[PDB]
Design a protein around this ligand. Structure first.
Ligand code: CLA
Ligand code: CLA
Ligand code: CLA
Ligand code: CLA
Ligand code: CLA
Ligand code: CLA
Ligand code: CLA
Ligand code: CLA
Ligand code: CLA
Ligand SMILES: CC1=C(C#C/C(C)=C/C=C/C(C)=C/C=C/C=C(C)/C=C/C=C(C)/C=C/[C@@]23O[C@]2(C)C[C@@H](O)CC3(C)C)C(C)(C)C[C@H](O)C1
Lengths: 180, 177, 171, 150
């Protein structure tokens, strides 16, 4: 099980053996040294990633369609109604995800990271790594969107188009040199 | 075993013999074996009646005689007229309900002039039934949330899919009709 | 091995915490200190965060007592960017020397938490456990001063002046 | 006459199941937890529908023009989300439980008897019935609870 590392000549932690997808020997802050936490962290990493992937497409695509910018949506949409209705809808779904099924004791023991919602039988220890890596990329992206929202105060497609039109007058250097 | 949810868990009482067994009973409502047969009768009944309903909710709205919720009062039919119908329907109902819930005729009374009874047709009855039952549920809920006719709902969604969907609709104060 | 007790009445200490290092009260529910090498680092960081917080909670109050405004009005009384630049330009050698344990390229092997500056010879186990105890207060305090200013908007000492003359109706 | 599945093992048992809903034991286990929780919720509600209407706060059906219903609904759902998950999970960890999720821990007085277990559900059943009634009187008249008593 050869695997690459996140920084050239480092040595991986001893609890990261490559046994799991998208392991690149990266845990300097030692947050997965205990195995049971490493189990939950693994579920959390895939779930934050999946949500960032949905989020970043959700943030970009309506702005491409001219339906508005993602961080200005709350002057046309009421947040509190949206969030009430969303939590009503989401709650039994999240419940069942954490529960492992519909039963009170779990019963119908399902994988809460990788359930079988796959009609194309595409699941391998490789596609798992691709899902993780795409997710990590999207999480970094959604971090970018939020910081860019605050610093430049324009949307992300606008930010891209500005960089393409004026690469020297629209970059992190120029935008942070000024008061912002 | 084809099941309703992926993972491969069926209740024990739902074995896979009857038509439409997809391991679906997470509330254990058919655990007792005597209640199961009654329920197997009423599923097909509800199903057939909804099938008629759903076809009867669309056809006079196509023809331009008003939507289904405004089709009674548009051609009269008051509470006395539903009472006379209900008295008239009672005769066939008690004729049906005189037989047991264990007799196969209680679902399948044998009126088959074209001789199209197979197993494929029984599952197809149950599947089209359950589709029409959810469709009636859909009609009622749409009626209240959107406050327009179902064919209007379908036409708006086909022409403007982001514009008119459940997400848009449910972000207004919805009990409106 | 916890003589001085634990953070919750009947709680079990974690397996990595065995009452060996100062001010251990067996508190690690997220298991951030399971790795020992990491816990060694964690210890230095907590003590440093503690020593920095104590100079800060003093510096947020003792100027205010002598009538200079509160800590959020310090931006009026100084050039904020400029002092920040000299602070970062003076921290650069001294923090490097703290981390390197000396001045030479190949590290020093001095204790980088407890270097040896003690002409009064007060370095005892009690004082080590009192550094962290007074420290955990000052961190909690500073966490207060921020959250008090966000929920209210008056001065720190004004929030105390409220609470004695308004026990019920403070929150 | 008691039914077959419904034996007399568990608290507040009276042998009532004309519908055979709790035939399966694991279903009955869920039923039991859900009855107790529904009972426990209905009591805070039956009291919470009288006690802040006696003191000059206005009736239970008047709550709409005293609060922001949308926003309070959001706040309630945002504190229910962790705590109901913790109730359901039996703690905070990813893997489930072994901290009994009907009758957890809160008894410093040693009052957990079969009598008190039965009396949780006994007082609950008519708080439920009461709340079911309390709404029905308002829909058939237009009156408040203590005004319905006249
Ligand atoms: C100068 C600093 C430095 C250097 C030389 C590298 C070099 C590398 N990183 Mg690391 N990395 C760094 C800092 C650095 N990283 C930092 C600050 C972070 C954020 C924590 C990461 C997070 C990171 C991730 C998540 C990954 C890498 C990976 C890698 C490899 C990617 C190959 C490539 O062509 O990248 C293209 C540009 C390469 C060894 C990848 C890897 O493991 O590949 C085998 C990988 O998945 N790095
Ligand atoms: C919520 C996000 C999240 C979570 C839960 C995880 C969880 C994990 N990562 Mg992943 N990872 C992430 C995002 C996340 N990661 C991102 C965004 C990148 C790209 C930089 C990576 C790149 C990466 C690599 C290359 C590797 C991991 C690995 C791991 C595993 C061991 C390390 C650990 O436990 O840290 C737990 C993480 C947290 C508790 C997140 C808290 C972070 C704090 C609050 C600061 C973050 C803010 C900062 C400004 C940004 C663990 C399952 C290792 C592994 O073995 O995977 C199989 C591994 O080799 N991660
Ligand atoms: C993953 C999370 C996520 C979240 C929180 C949202 C949230 C939202 N979307 Mg987005 N969307 C998403 C993913 C998401 N979307 C994805 C993946 C796509 C691509 C398919 C879209 C495509 C999309 C479009 C094209 C539009 C929105 C719009 C909206 C907003 C209005 C929805 C509404 O009125 O009632 C929601 C009611 C319930 C959920 C119940 C709302 C903030 C609208 C908007 O205002 O754009 C700026 C809009 O036009 N979304
Ligand atoms: C409304 C009810 C609701 C409920 C019951 C849950 C329940 C859960 N969420 Mg979910 N979630 C929800 C809404 C909800 N969520 C919403 C509205 C969002 C934004 C779309 C998320 C996004 C989300 C993320 C990103 C994560 C969770 C995770 C979890 C699990 C761990 C909770 C925890 O903090 O442990 C106590 C310690 C738990 C199963 C976490 C998880 O799966 O961890 C393994 C996790 O990382 N949820
Ligand atoms: C559950 C099944 C069901 C029920 C309760 C009804 C009930 C009704 N139908 Mg409908 N209808 C049905 C099935 C049903 N139909 C089916 C399957 C079709 C397609 C053949 C129709 C096609 C239809 C037409 C074309 C019309 C009715 C009309 C009516 C109404 C007047 C009937 C009358 O007075 O004699 C009445 C409310 C009449 C009406 O007034 O609609 C507005 C009318 O013109 N029905
Ligand atoms: C008014 C006279 C009349 C009578 C005596 C019956 C009698 C019956 N109906 Mg019927 N029904 C009627 C009118 C009537 N119906 C009308 C007007 C409709 C609307 C078209 C229906 C729609 C209907 C449905 C959907 C169902 C019944 C069912 C039944 C049976 C069980 C009822 C029950 O559980 O009672 C307690 C003793 C029973 C034979 C049920 C059945 O067949 O269950 C197996 C059933 O599910 N009926
Ligand atoms: C984290 C520790 C820390 C930091 C970053 C600051 C930062 C500051 N102090 Mg404070 N101060 C501190 C601790 C600190 N102090 C302590 C421990 C004391 C007690 C000895 C004071 C007593 C003090 C006085 C009397 C004054 C300052 C003042 C200042 C400001 C200008 C300094 C200058 O002009 O040279 C600057 C914001 C000056 C100021 O502008 O106050 C608003 C000023 O007059 N400080
Ligand atoms: C399910 C239980 C439940 C629920 C959902 C409510 C809900 C409510 N209570 Mg009630 N309350 C309850 C039980 C409950 N109560 C009980 C058991 C008591 C007795 C301790 C009270 C005593 C009480 C008082 C004194 C007041 C409320 C008020 C309110 C309203 C606003 C609360 C707020 O602003 O934060 C809200 C409708 C406030 C209100 O505005 O009522 C109209 C208010 O002043 N409640
Ligand atoms: C739980 C115990 C309980 C008690 C002590 C009461 C007591 C009362 N009910 Mg209520 N009621 C209840 C449950 C209860 N109800 C339930 C479960 C329902 C649904 C079936 C109702 C539906 C109901 C209606 C429709 C009416 C009453 C009325 C009354 C009052 C007059 C009694 C009468 O004539 O009938 C009396 C204060 C009457 C009333 O409100 O008098 C002004 C009245 O009209 N009740
Ligand atoms: C321990 C533990 C856990 C924990 C924890 C917790 C609660 C951690 C939090 C700690 C906390 C709260 C740490 C604060 C730091 C503040 C600092 C460093 C001070 C700087 C502040 C400075 C330098 C400011 C200087 C000022 O000049 C400024 C800028 C303006 C002036 O007018 C006045 C002053 C002088 C003020 C878990 C998560 C629960 C589980 C785990 O398992 C175990």
């Amino acid at each position: 099980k050869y695997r690459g590392l996140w920084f050239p000549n480092i040595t991986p932690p001893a609890y990261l053996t490559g046994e799991f997808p998208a392991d690149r020997g990266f845990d300097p802050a030692g947050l997965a040294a205990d195995p049971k936490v490493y189990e939950r962290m693994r579920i959390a990493e895939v779930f934050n990633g999946r949500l960032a992937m949905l989020a970043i497409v959700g943030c970009v695509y309506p702005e491409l369609l001219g339906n508005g910018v993602w961080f200005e949506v709350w002057n046309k949409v009421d947040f509190y109604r949206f969030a009430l209705i969303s939590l009503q809808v989401v709650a039994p779904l999240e419940y069942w995800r954490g529960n492992g099924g519909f039963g009170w004791d779990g019963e119908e023991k399902y994988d809460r990271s990788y359930p079988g919602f796959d009609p194309c039988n595409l699941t391998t220890e490789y596609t798992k790594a691709a899902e993780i890596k795409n997710g990590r990329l999207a999480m970094i992206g959604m971090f970018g969107l939020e910081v860019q929202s605050h610093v430049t105060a324009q949307g992300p497609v606008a930010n891209l188009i500005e960089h393409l039109r004026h690469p020297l007058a629209a970059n992190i250097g120029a935008n942070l040199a000024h008061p912002w | 075993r084809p099941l309703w949810f992926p993972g491969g868990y069926a209740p024990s009482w739902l074995t896979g013999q009857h038509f439409g067994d997809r391991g679906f009973d997470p509330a254990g409502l058919a655990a007792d074996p005597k209640v199961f047969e009654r329920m197997r009768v009423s599923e097909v009944y509800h199903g057939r009646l909804a099938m008629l309903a759903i076809v009867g909710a669309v056809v006079p709205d196509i023809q331009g005689k008003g939507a289904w919720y405004e089709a009674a009062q548009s051609a009269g039919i008051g509470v006395n007229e539903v009472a006379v119908f209900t008295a008239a329907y009672g005769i066939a109902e008690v004729a049906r309900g005189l037989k047991a819930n264990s007799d196969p005729t209680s679902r399948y009374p044998g009126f088959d002039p074209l001789n199209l009874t197979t197993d494929y047709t029984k599952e197809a009855e149950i599947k089209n039934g359950r589709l029409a039952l959810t469709a009636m549920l859909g009609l009622e809920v749409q009626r209240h949330v959107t406050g327009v006719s179902p064919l209007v709902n379908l036409v708006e969604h086909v022409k403007h899919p982001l514009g008119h969907n459940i997400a848009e609709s449910v972000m207004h104060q919805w009990p409106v009709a | 091995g916890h003589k001085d007790g634990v953070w919750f009445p009947g709680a079990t200490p974690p397996a990595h915490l065995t009452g060996e290092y100062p001010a251990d009260r067996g508190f690690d529910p997220l298991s951030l200190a399971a790795d020992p090498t990491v816990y060694a680092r964690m210890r230095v960081s907590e003590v440093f965060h503690a020593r920095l917080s104590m100079l800060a909670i003093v510096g947020a109050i003792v100027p205010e007592v002598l009538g200079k405004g509160a800590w959020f009005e310090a931006g009026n009384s100084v050039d904020g960017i400029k002092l920040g630049f000299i602070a970062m330009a003076i921290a650069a050698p001294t923090e490097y020397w703290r981390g390197n344990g000396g001045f030479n390229w190949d590290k020093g092997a001095a204790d980088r938490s407890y270097p040896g500056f003690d002409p009064l010879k007060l370095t005892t186990d009690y004082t080590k456990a009192a550094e962290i105890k007074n420290g955990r207060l000052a961190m909690a305090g500073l966490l207060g001063l921020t959250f008090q200013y966000l929920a209210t908007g008056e001065s720190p000492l004004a929030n105390l002046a409220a609470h004695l003359a308004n026990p019920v109706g403070a929150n």
